């Protein structure tokens, strides 16, 4: 068969849980930076579908550039005022026109309209209390490039792309208790099920987890929607209702740790200086956002784990090696961590320029073994998983386009 | 104070088999955005100080660069579509005179737009700011809640948010090579000698064992190269200079230097620019996409995702703690017995900036040294810095530290 550049090594260090400290952050769906990542990736997905429908392949584009300018608002118990809309600028580049010299024809594609529509539909989905007709302006300066039909023909072969570069991706698994608690706290508080029970909870949620030994302090920033709280008393009730939900979640998935929960810690209840919003996001006035300043593709910010600085959101899922490798590294690590005997796993991938993207210069697998396991019994299974995913790298591309994996 | 010191027993970065490090130089679009953002904050600080004797709330850590278009040509090309730059962020836009019962507007927008143009003029020798660039401004008023926290103790300020900064020391050989290569090639002395060198220089260092491969993407300014031959001569002249640098600071390593590797001499298709930045080529930028405050991008080191550039130097811990962690790590690495030091600092929103929720220190010890002998010394350093935390603000305002 085929031999790739895969390295497996035993990593003989303390695993993450046994280290004394951990810090983990997540910017939730309605956080201005996360809004920008989500729009960036939504626009790419929409363009991919546009290209697939017309040509049966995906053409060059990158929409990993989105700027969110905070609006103007005046929150008030019982329902505040949205004064000036949130301004969002879409940027990047996308293939717009195909020049066919053989036929005497030009094909033009709906790049700008597709982008603006995709952005608006994304905001509609995730921001329950934002009226996208009146509360948002979506502007577009996405570059519109041209391309020869003959190069479209080549792309329609849908062969495995060549790496154009020496690029790097890194991932790991499993998530620690603290990581899982931070991730699932945000996910739960932004789930439809919680919203329906406590509509006052906005989507701009930020969760910080500090572990000291076996004590996890969770600090939650949570935008409250002011039409659902008539006074400071009802605001407090919302905080305490959430505090209890999060307590129950901590019992469910971090049993055995001491968990301490703090919510909206900059509040001053008595002065009524609290985290009230009209729309459920501080994008309405308090804060601004842009792409690549938040969660990594695993959904977390983790200064005790290796992190890539590349912004995956909005990059071409068909040719951008960095995006594909950071996602792939995460997927491979996740499967290797499910193997019997693996306590902890790191996967690093480095491309070989001029070579197919599933023929990397190096793919390094670091494994912390459980007690009484031999790295050499695990290695064959681990290499098989890595080779499985590399064989199916085009499947990964498809998963990105269909939104089956996360970019933030 | 919540200071925590731990021994860290892992392989030191220099001894690991592989290292990858990157620096986005001054004229790279992402770095243009970081530097503009910080320029705007510095100018607003000065304006607020002039009018009120104090810095008012702002955070202009938002700048979006939309690439323009150009037509490079040997001996000098021309710009075709202007680079569009949007200044954004929060700022104190107005003051309420409760006596007159009138709103008074502050010159935020004029100050911001001028600061941005002056910064661009500083870093891009060959840009024409009247023709090649559009600078727009949509900075807006921040929420009153954040303004109150800002004012409550702006003696020792309260932390604006719950965030963390990170820093480490010392730099590895590969990190220093990458950092100093960019700094040298964008030094005034070098560009005076080789004016064909544009400021958009991206340097990536890949170490494998004792081999360091340096990949450089360097914009060449087309008014200073009359033909393809002169272009080649610039490449080889820069190459020689970097070789000499690598002999100085990477002694004992095999260093390969690769410059502008996508060049196609057969088709005369090379990295030529009119302005010295890829921003003219449709490439985009925004803030916090690039270097950390130590000037580097390092996936083999801890990083904070906070973007220091443009954040206010009074109470934004995303700026202050990233600088502070670097200062602390640097001093601890000086200690005999410390091989590597990692510092992570976490705030709690509303608490004084010199009362972090956690100030976390990890130390890889030199062989045979006891962390027990080191711990007290490390703690003292961290406490000394927390005692002197207003020096951070002062160093930042005086322009004595970098934010990227
Ligand atoms: C942590 O405290 C507070 C923290 C913040 C920080 S937000 C950004 C700071 C910056 N854009 C600024 O100009 O102030 C950044 C993020 O913090 C969250 N946030 C916004 N308002 C908040 C609030 N009232 N309380 C807690 N978190 C909030 C939200 O997720 C935002 O994206 C604010 N604030 O700027 O109005 C204001 C607070 O209030 C003192
Ligand atoms: Mg942000
Ligand atoms: Mg970039
Ligand atoms: Mg931050």
Swiss-Prot record, chain A:
**Organism lineage string:** Archaea, Methanobacteriati, Methanobacteriota, Methanomada group, Methanococci
Q: Which InterPro entries match?
A: AdoMet_synthase_2_family, AdoMet_synthase_3, S-AdoMet_synthetase_arc
| PANTHER family assigned to the protein according to its UniProt record, in alphabetical order | S-ADENOSYLMETHIONINE SYNTHASE
Coiled-coil spans are none
What reaction does this enzyme carry out catalytically? Answer: L-methionine + ATP + H2O = S-adenosyl-L-methionine + phosphate + diphosphate
Top EC class, one word: transferase
Q: What is this protein called?
A: S-adenosylmethionine synthase
Q: So where does ATP get bound?
A: 143-148
Q: Does the keyword Transit peptide apply?
A: no
Gene Ontology biological process terms, A to Z: one-carbon metabolic process; S-adenosylmethionine biosynthetic process
For this protein, what is any one GO molecular function term?
methionine adenosyltransferase activity
Q: What is its EC number?
A: 2.5.1.6
Q: What HAMAP family does this protein's entry cite?
A: S_AdoMet_synth2 (MF_00136)
Tree of life domain: Archaea
What keywords sit in the KW lines? ATP-binding, Magnesium, Nucleotide-binding, One-carbon metabolism, Transferase
What functional role does this protein have? Catalyzes the formation of S-adenosylmethionine from methionine and ATP.
- Cofactor field: Mg(2+)
The pathway to which it is assigned is: Amino-acid biosynthesis; S-adenosyl-L-methionine biosynthesis; S-adenosyl-L-methionine from L-methionine: step 1/1
Q: How does it assemble?
A: Homodimer.
Which organism was this protein described from?
Methanocaldococcus jannaschii (strain ATCC 43067 / DSM 2661 / JAL-1 / JCM 10045 / NBRC 100440)
Family affiliation:
Belongs to the AdoMet synthase 2 family.
Q: Which NCBIfam families match?
A: PRK04439.1-3, PRK04439.1-5
Curated annotation (Swiss-Prot), chain B:
Q: Has UniProt tagged this entry with the keyword Transcription? A: no
Return the InterPro entries for the record.
AdoMet_synthase_2_family, AdoMet_synthase_3, S-AdoMet_synthetase_arc
Cofactor(s), by name? Mg(2+)
Q: Which residues bind ATP?
A: 140-145
Do the record's keywords include Mitochondrion? no
Q: What class of enzyme is it?
A: transferase
A biological process from GO: S-adenosylmethionine biosynthetic process
Give me the reactions it catalyses: L-methionine + ATP + H2O = S-adenosyl-L-methionine + phosphate + diphosphate
Source domain of life: Archaea
Q: What is its EC number?
A: 2.5.1.6
Pathway assignment reads:
Amino-acid biosynthesis; S-adenosyl-L-methionine biosynthesis; S-adenosyl-L-methionine from L-methionine: step 1/1
- Name the Gene3D superfamilies on file: 3.30.300.10, S-adenosylmethionine synthetase, C-terminal domain (3.30.300.280)
Q: Which UniProt keywords apply?
A: ATP-binding, Magnesium, Nucleotide-binding, One-carbon metabolism, Transferase
GO molecular function annotation:
ATP binding; magnesium ion binding; methionine adenosyltransferase activity
For this chain, the family text in UniProt reads:
Belongs to the AdoMet synthase 2 family.
- Subunit structure, briefly? Homodimer.
Function, in words: Catalyzes the formation of S-adenosylmethionine from methionine and ATP.
What PANTHER family does the annotation carry?
Answer: S-ADENOSYLMETHIONINE SYNTHASE
Q: Can you say what this protein is called?
A: S-adenosylmethionine synthase
Source organism per UniProt: Methanocaldococcus jannaschii (strain ATCC 43067 / DSM 2661 / JAL-1 / JCM 10045 / NBRC 100440)
Give the gene symbol.
Answer: mat
């Amino acid at each position: 068969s085929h031999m790739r550049n895969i390295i497996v090594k035993k990593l003989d260090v303390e695993p993450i849980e046994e280290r004394p400290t951990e810090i983990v952050e997540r910017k939730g769906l309605g956080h201005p930076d996360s809004i920008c990542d989500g729009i960036a990736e939504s626009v790419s997905r929409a363009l991919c579908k546009m290209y697939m429908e017309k040509f049966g392949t995906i053409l060059h584009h990158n929409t990993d550039q989105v700027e969110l300018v905070g609006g103007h608002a005046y929150p008030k118990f019982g329902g505040g005022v949205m004064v000036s809309p949130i301004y969002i600028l879409l940027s990047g580049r996308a293939t717009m026109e195909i020049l066919d010299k053989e036929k005497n024809e030009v094909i033009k594609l709906p790049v700008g309209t597709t982008a603006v529509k995709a952005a608006k539909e994304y905001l509609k989905k995730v921001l329950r209390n934002v009226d996208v007709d009146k509360d948002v302006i979506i502007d577009c300066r996405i570059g519109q490039g041209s391309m020869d039909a003959v190069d479209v023909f080549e792309r329609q072969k849908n062969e495995v792309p060549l790496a154009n570069d020496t690029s790097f991706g890194v991932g790991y698994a499993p998530l620690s208790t603290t990581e899982r608690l931070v991730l699932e706290t945000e996910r739960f508080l932004n789930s439809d099920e919680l919203k329906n029970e406590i509509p006052a909870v906005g989507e701009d949620i930020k969760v910080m987890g500090l572990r000291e030994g076996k004590k996890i302090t969770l600090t939650i920033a949570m935008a409250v929607v002011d039409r659902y709280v008539k006074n400071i008393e009802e605001y407090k009730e919302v905080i305490e209702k959430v505090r209890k939900k999060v307590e129950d979640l901590a019992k469910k998935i971090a049993d055995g740790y001491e968990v301490e929960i703090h919510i909206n810690t900059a509040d001053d209840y008595e002065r009524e200086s609290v985290y009230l919003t009209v729309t459920g996001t501080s994008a309405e006035m308090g804060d601004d956002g842009s792409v690549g300043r938040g969660n990594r593709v695993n959904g977390l910010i983790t200064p005790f784990r290796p992190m890539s600085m590349e912004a995956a959101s909005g990059k071409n899922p068909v040719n951008h090696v960095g995006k594909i490798y950071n996602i792939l590294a995460n997927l491979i690590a996740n499967d290797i961590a499910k193997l019997e005997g693996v306590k902890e796993c790191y996967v690093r991938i480095l491309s070989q320029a001029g070579k197919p993207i599933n023929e990397p210069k190096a793919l390094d697998i670091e494994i912390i073994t459980e007690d009484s396991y031999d790295i050499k019994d695990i290695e064959p299974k681990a290499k098989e998983i890595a080779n499985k995913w590399l064989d199916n790298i085009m499947e990964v591309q498809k998963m990105i386009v269909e939104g089956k994996v996360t970019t933030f």
